[model samples]
Target: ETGCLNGNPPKRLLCGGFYPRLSCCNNTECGKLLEEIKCALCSPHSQSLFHLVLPLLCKDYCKEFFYTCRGHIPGFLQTTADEFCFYYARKDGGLCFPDFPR
Candidate 1:
């Protein structure tokens, strides 16, 4: 199960970056990037088990993604379809996956 207190990040976002203190899952831009990672990792699973178990693991650089990339989109507004690709991609290292992307 996931537990997030007031002003804390949602469980879904925490799975994306492993910071329960984050609150950027509602942000479309960041959610867009996170969704890409999730879809890629969990798409073939039965009932999307990867998505279901993401909150149980630890994520790296969660705070940075929440504060930096997610922060760029204010008020968690809806992101355009064009911006729904992976914004957090890198050449060497980025999201890694066991069950979910982190």
Candidate 2:
């Protein structure tokens, strides 16, 4: 079975507040990037298993998510928000994020 989160995830992340302790099926814990969100497995998007299985963030969502939280994202993803969008965004006009905003 997939090991995942089991509670309300924080809305804002690295650029904002502190992270509560968390864990994931991939044998990971709440890092700056994940602490604000849930494990990809915990998300309802089953198809996510096919892709990076890291969860999907719509281009639109990525756009805003980038600028809104660009500070730490560069450190985490190691890329500019502009470039980061393409790496993990809905480029094919498909679903953006599993349960995201954008």
lDDT of each: 0.35, 0.46
Top model by lDDT, which number? 2
**Looking at model 2, which ten-residue stretch has the lowest summed lDDT?**
11-20
- Candidate 2 per-residue lDDT, tens place, 59-98, comes to 6656765666555444645667667776777677774453
Candidate number with greatest TM-score: 2
Q: State in Å the error of residue 74, model 1.
A: 3.9
Model 1 bad stretches (over 4 Å): 1-32, 38-42, 46-57, 75-102
lDDT at 20, model 1? 34
| Candidate 1 C-alpha lDDT tens digits along 1-102 | 222222342333223342333323446666765654454322223122223123212133333344445446564235532233233222234223323433
**CA-RMSD of model 1:** 13.8
lDDT for 40 (candidate 1)? 37
